[PDB]
């Protein structure tokens, strides 16, 4: 309309030519995800105008169209691949939009949104001009080209020869728009046999490649990659940008290869892996010839490098440069060939073999261009008589890889890159971070060139020797204070108010109590820093037991006594105990030879008696942990811990808090004590109520509580309950991880939720988050006088982004292990590395310190989540699952098998689970490599004594090694099978076998699809393909749409020679027992077999054979019509066949032979017994079985015993059981397949021909028992012409694999061809 001097008039075809292999793969992944625009190349200009431009961009437009016919090209697909068509005449897409009314920063953003509008590739043009008006004469102009079509290299080409035209430049190279074609076409001559010494050099370059880096991710990778991405403009410093040019004259490498060294060493550094593959694009137009031409001529080519971390970066730049230049020589290679050849496991998630990218692209003979095509504005300008060129830059092509370097442009001095990164992976933040250490890298490079890639330390300097300030925790006086001194107070002053619930305890009864108790320990030879072992019962005792003892200066030792004795003996004697108090019950419980005290017998003392005597002493407990190792916490430690977590809590009078945890559990310290600081309530929860999910929701609704800390474990079992929720309560959740599921369900049930972290050894706690989103769950903020660090194995500062060990230090560390003091000097060390740090602890805890500055918990560096040469997020496969309606709870270990292979099982808890729907479902929700090869279904899941899942307890899976032949089930299956078996020339394809693992690849899958459109009438993608690539899950898929309509005839093989063998159901009217035959038969003959329309259309199957003939031959001579004609059967297909060879002479057409395999002839002794409808449902049960040599016996006396739709339903759900039915058909389904067989059987019962001479082949079965005569009754209808014979089987094995070789030989023996 801006445009109408242009006229659209109707376009025709000029020529049809093959793609390239260069262009296969963009065009592939277009196809792959419609909404793609990674690969929409953009270049734009701010173009202000004089009025003498006239004309001129319509009829230079016209003119160059009509030059450089690769400008006119669609790239459509067939069965027989994909095309390049050149169209005589293309309408342009221009589009105009008027941008006065924007401001500047919308206008990028309107122009980036409006570039990436996606391309169909089989509809020209494949490529768009955009076009802003800004002011009066003042225009931005954005043209878009897909990369499938043409390259970056002929952009510079078209932009030249565009700028001459327009009177920019003075001069240009001519531009060859037609050579694209030649190359293309001569490639699709080539062969590249698998011998080839470039493919074997790759074969073996990438052989030991993991299939996906081990970059720590900010988000879960999406199960299919959705192509979006970002970019970050970044410049190298003068400085810097001199001495890498110079670093590179120092060596024998390019300034390429240099910054390539430097990237993969920032790979190393953020992922901790040795082995790292790069992508990178070379040019590809090594022939002269090709210097001119438009095309897409750009190759991948992916450098697999296994970084030593002990050379130098010397040494290590020139390992790189060695195999960069060796890996050029073999560049001839597609990447697409190289993947065909490596056979990777397909991966919806991931870019095949390589992830990472780094383009390296310098233009030559663009120099007037140069400024305008950076990424970043210049003032730099263009001017021409009619017009002037200005920047305008673009964000593009996003989203091709995970992460891609991009560099080679220079300005004032600084190299100038772009960072694109996959935002579904990473956050900007972490880009920034980065480019950030990128920097860094290149910087220690020019400045320390000899030093090892060890000793390399990419971190920023970290100011006040912490890594974050937030993870400082605020310093206070804290661990000065008196505990006891607190409490005293708080009983002096709450008087006869409630203390401890049960009947209840007042505070002033409670003193009481601590004063009888400490006594009682006094007079019975209890000293300060003596170690009293503490076996009780959950009663408002135990509070009152831990104070006493403190206050008798000794520390106590829990002896749980529900755990059991074994683990209570081993405490004992490592923990040497004065002696043990425990309660009236228990004084014989443990055979031990250590003195025992029954706390009843304590008196009560009144406080005020023995308040001189009473002062903690230095020790308060030896805390056992998993060999027993002792923990010895200090008083000042607790305090600490105590008041840090009142500042989080702020517990005051009303406080009311449910103690649910084992005391022998240190985190119980908090339930049993910070209320009684503040003179709230402890309530003693019962063991037997917090371990029954609805004694403990009546216990809640019941007292009243607000505040509650628990595990996870004891958090499920609530939710789990039918729970209501409290909103004044406020909940700590600690032990393990958080995950987001529990997270959410929690935020709806409580008022406030702390996540909260620690190990024994530094007092309970050490950090904890306050959460108010489950999407956002960390370790969160450190408590007071609390120091959190993450290290590598050097025990240096991590830089941000990447994995280490988490130390802590300050006032929470533990005295030391009870009498280990080796493991105590190993674990509580001060280091070089962090000489202000003072004493800190080694938690053994892997920890991931964030670009945010928050710390995420991955734990335990011990556990192996390295696979195949990566490692997994074992929780997000736990998130996954857990949200399957029906899944409870889920756990994913990683398990060594057989060599030296890893595999992932998953462990499953629910009230209704179906384990093959589990797989089912994961597939098409996760990343291939995060799909467990094994389900398991547990009752409940093992827990240790504290409440913690106990993953050692798991019980050890047993892995399938290997997929079990499974054949195909119905129509939809049987021409599928018959299709990846030809489309692959693999011989027998069970419904389970993987299209890809199978020898499958791209091109093949754009092949197979586009035949699966025209077998089946419908849409299908190679999306639909890529995830659905078992005939299996396909013929689901497939099965679902009720509107498919197959043809009755299916192609077993396409041969070379002119007449077809063709072939007729039996009665059951399907074509699955050919299968077999045909995969035996030379494959130098074409064969067709036709099914009942009965099998897909409801009352379709023919009840005459007469009928069903003429049906048949009209069917026939659509695809072969004229004879001589070559027909068979098995069984009653011989019949069928029979019939249609009695026909075709009425119609003068000749008949070859017909083949017949141990058929009964129509004959009445031969029609079936009178059978009723039970009957007829059990011989149809055996008939459906036979076919896979199963047998299905349902007896027709059971079946009378039922109505008739109960024994349809009985018969399909018997045919499933043995899986030769699918577990998705309906019993509509099975009435198509009842009543086709019913239909036969009638056909037979009304069909005796009078007798005429055919030339036949009779293969009789000699091994069936059931006697129909030496001929099968032939002898009564032909006389002269029938050759007969007599081959192992019966009636049905004869189709079996082992028996029908011989027929298959036979049959070619009596029918030779050529
Ligand atoms: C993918 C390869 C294709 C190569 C084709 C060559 C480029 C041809 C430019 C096509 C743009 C034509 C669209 C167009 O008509 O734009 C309209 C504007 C304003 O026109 P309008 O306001 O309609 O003027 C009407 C004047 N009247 C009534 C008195 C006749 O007029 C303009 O804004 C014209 C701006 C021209 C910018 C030329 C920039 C040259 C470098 C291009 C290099 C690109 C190759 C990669
Ligand atoms: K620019």
């Known amino acids: 309309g801006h445009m109408n001097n242009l006229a659209r008039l109707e376009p025709e075809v000029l020529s049809r030519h093959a793609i390239s292999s260069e262009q296969l793969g963009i065009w592939y992944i277009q196809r792959l995800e419609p909404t793609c625009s990674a690969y929409n190349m953009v270049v734009a200009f701010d173009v202000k105008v004089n009025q003498s431009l006239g004309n001129k961009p319509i009829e230079i437009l016209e003119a160059v169209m009509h030059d450089y016919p690769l400008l006119r090209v669609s790239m459509p697909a067939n069965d027989q691949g994909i095309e390049q068509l050149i169209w005589d005449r293309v309408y342009p897409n221009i589009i105009f939009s008027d941008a006065r009314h924007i401001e500047a920063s919308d206008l990028t953003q309107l122009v980036e949104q409006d570039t990436k509008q996606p391309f169909d590739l089989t509809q020209p043009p494949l490529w768009r001009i955009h076009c802003y ?12 080209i897909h990369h499938a079509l043409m390259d970056f290299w002929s952009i510079g080409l078209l932009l030249r020869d565009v700028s001459k035209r327009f009177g920019l430049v003075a001069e240009s190279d001519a531009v060859n728009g037609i050579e694209f074609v030649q190359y293309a076409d001569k490639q699709q001559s080539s062969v590249i046999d698998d011998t080839d010494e470039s493919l074997i050099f790759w074969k073996n370059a990438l052989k030991h490649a993991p299939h996906v880096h081990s970059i720590p991710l900010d988000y879960p990778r999406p199960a299919v990659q959705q192509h979006k991405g970002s970019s970050l403009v970044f410049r190298v410093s003068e400085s810097v940008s001199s001495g890498l040019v110079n670093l590179a004259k120092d060596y024998e490498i390019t300034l390429f290869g240099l910054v390539l060294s430097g990237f993969y060493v920032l790979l190393h550094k953020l992922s901790n892996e040795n082995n790292l593959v790069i992508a990178t694009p070379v040019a590809g137009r090594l022939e002269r010839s090709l210097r001119n031409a438009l095309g897409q001529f750009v190759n991948t080519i992916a450098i697999h490098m296994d970084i030593d971390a002990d050379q130098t970066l010397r040494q290590f730049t020139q390992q790189v440069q060695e195999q960069l230049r060796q890996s050029l020589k073999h560049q001839k290679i597609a990447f ?47 001017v021409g008589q009619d017009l002037t060129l200005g920047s305008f830059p673009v964000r593009q092509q996003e989203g091709q890889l995970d992460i891609t370097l991009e560099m080679g442009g220079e300005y004032q001095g600084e190299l100038v890159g772009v960072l694109k990164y996959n935002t579904d992976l990473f956050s900007a933040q972490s880009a920034e971070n980065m480019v950030q250490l990128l920097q860094a890298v290149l910087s220690e490079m020019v400045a320390h060139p000899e030093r090892k890639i060890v000793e390399l330390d990419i971190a920023p300097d970290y100011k006040d020797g912490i890594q974050f300030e937030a993870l400082r925790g605020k310093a206070t006086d804290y661990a000065q204070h008196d505990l006891f001194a607190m409490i005293l107070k708080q009983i002096d002053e709450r008087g006869d108010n409630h203390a401890l619930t049960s009947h209840t305890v007042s505070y002033r009864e409670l003193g009481q109590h601590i004063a009888g108790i400490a006594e009682y320990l006094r007079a019975h030879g209890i000293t300060q820093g003596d170690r009293v072992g503490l076996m009780l019962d959950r009663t408002a005792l135990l509070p009152a037991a831990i104070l006493g003892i403190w206050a008798a200066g000794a520390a106590y030792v829990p002896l749980d006594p529900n755990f059991p004795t074994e683990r209570l003996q081993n405490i004992i004697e490592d923990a040497e105990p004065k002696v043990i108090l425990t309660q009236t019950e228990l004084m014989d419980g443990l055979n031990v030879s250590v003195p025992r005290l029954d706390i009843n017998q304590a008196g009560v003392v009144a406080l005020e008696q023995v308040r001189e005597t009473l002062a903690f002493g230095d020790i308060a407990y030896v805390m056992y942990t998993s060999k027993p190792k002792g923990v010895r916490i200090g008083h000042p430690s607790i305090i600490n811990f105590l008041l840090s977590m009142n500042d989080r809590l702020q517990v005051t009078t009303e406080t009311q808090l449910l103690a649910i945890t084992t005391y022998a559990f240190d985190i119980s310290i908090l339930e049993l004590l910070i209320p009684l600081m503040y003179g709230g309530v402890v309530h003693v929860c019962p063991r037997e109520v917090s371990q029954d999910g609805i004694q403990l929701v009546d216990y809640l609704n019941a007292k009243s509580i607000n505040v509650l800390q628990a595990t996870p474990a004891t958090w499920k079992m609530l939710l789990d309950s039918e729970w209501s929720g409290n909103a004044g309560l406020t909940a700590l959740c600690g032990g393990e991880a958080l995950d987001t599921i529990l997270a959410e369900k929690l935020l709806g049930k409580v008022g406030c939720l702390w996540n909260v972290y620690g190990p024994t050894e530094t007092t309970v706690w050490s950090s904890a988050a306050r959460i108010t989103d489950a999407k956002y769950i960390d370790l969160g903020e450190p408590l007071a006088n609390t120091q959190l660090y993450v290290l590598d194995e050097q025990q240096r500062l ?70 195949r040469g990566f490692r997994i997020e074992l929780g997000e496969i736990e998130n996954v699952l857990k949200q399957i309606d029906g899944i409870t709870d889920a756990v994913v270990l990683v398990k060594t098998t057989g060599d030296n292979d890893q595999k992932l099982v998953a462990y499953v808890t629910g009230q209704e689970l179906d384990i093959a729907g589990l797989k089912k479902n994961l597939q098409i929700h996760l990343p291939a490599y995060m799909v467990p090869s094994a389900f398991i279904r547990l009752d409940e899941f093992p827990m240790t004594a504290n409440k913690k899942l106990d993953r050692k307890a798991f019980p050890e899976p047993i892995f399938e090694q290997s997929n079990d032949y499974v054949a195909p089930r119905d129509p939809i299956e049987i021409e599928l099978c018959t299709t990846f078996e030809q489309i692959l020339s693999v011989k027998r394809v069970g419904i389970h076998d993987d299209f890809f693992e199978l020898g499958g690849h791209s091109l093949l899958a754009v092949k197979l699809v586009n035949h699966l459109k025209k077998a089946f009438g419908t849409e299908l993608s190679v999306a639909l393909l890529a995830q659905y690539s078992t005939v299996e899950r396909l013929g689901e898929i497939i099965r679902e749409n009720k509107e498919i309509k197959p043809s009755i005839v299916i192609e077993l093989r396409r041969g070379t020679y002119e007449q077809p063998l063709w072939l007729f159901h039996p009665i059951g009217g399907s074509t699955f027992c050919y299968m077999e035959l045909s995969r035996h038969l030379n494959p130098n003959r074409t064969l067709r077999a036709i099914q009942s329309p009965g099998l897909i259309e409801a009352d379709a199957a023919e009840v005459a054979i007469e009928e069903m003939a003429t049906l048949y031959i009209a069917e026939m001579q659509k695809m072969q019509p004229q004879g001589p004609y070559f027909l068979g059967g098995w069984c009653f297909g011989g019949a069928i066949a029979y019939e249609i060879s009695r026909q075709l002479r009425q119609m003068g057409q000749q008949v070859t032979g017909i083949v017949m395999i141990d058929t009964r002839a129509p004959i009445p002794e031969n029609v079936p017994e009178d059978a009723d409808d039970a009957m007829l449902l059990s011989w149809f049960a055996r008939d459906l079985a036979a076919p896979y040599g199963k047998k299905l016996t349902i007896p027709a006396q059971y079946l009378r015993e039922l109505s008739p739709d109960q024994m349809f339903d009985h018969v399909l759900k018997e045919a499933k059981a043995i899986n030769v039915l699918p577990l998705d058909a309906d019993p509509s389904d099975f009435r198509l397949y009842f009543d086709t067989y019913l239909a036969n059987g009638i056909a037979l019962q009304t069909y005796f021909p009078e007798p005429e001479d055919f030339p036949i082949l009779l293969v009789k079965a000699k091994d069936e028992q059931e006697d129909f005569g030496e001929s099968l009754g032939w002898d009564q209808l032909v006389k002269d012409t029938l050759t007969q014979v007599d081959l192992p089987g019966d009636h049905s094995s004869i189709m079996y694999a082992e028996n029908v070789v011989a027929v298959a030989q036979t049959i070619d023996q009596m029918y030779p061809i050529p």
């Open 133 to 144: 008006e800004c002011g009066q004469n003042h225009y931005v102009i954005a043209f878009v």
């Open 798 to 867: 991590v830089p941000p982004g990447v994995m280490g060990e988490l130390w802590i230090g300050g006032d929470g560390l533990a005295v030391d292990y009870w009498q280990r003091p080796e493991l105590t000097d190993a674990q509580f060390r001060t280091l070089p590395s962090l000489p202000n740090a003072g004493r800190l602890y080694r938690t053994g805890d892997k920890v991931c310190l964030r670009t945010d500055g928050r710390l995420t918990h991955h734990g335990r560096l011990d556990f192996q989540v390295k696979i």
């Open 336 to 382: 697409s060939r190289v993947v065909e050849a490596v056979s990777p496991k397909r991966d919806g998630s991931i870019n095949p073999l390589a992830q990472i990218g780094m383009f390296w692209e310098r233009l030559g003979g663009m120099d007037e261009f140069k400024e305008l095509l950076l990424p970043i504005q210049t003032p730099a300008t263009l």
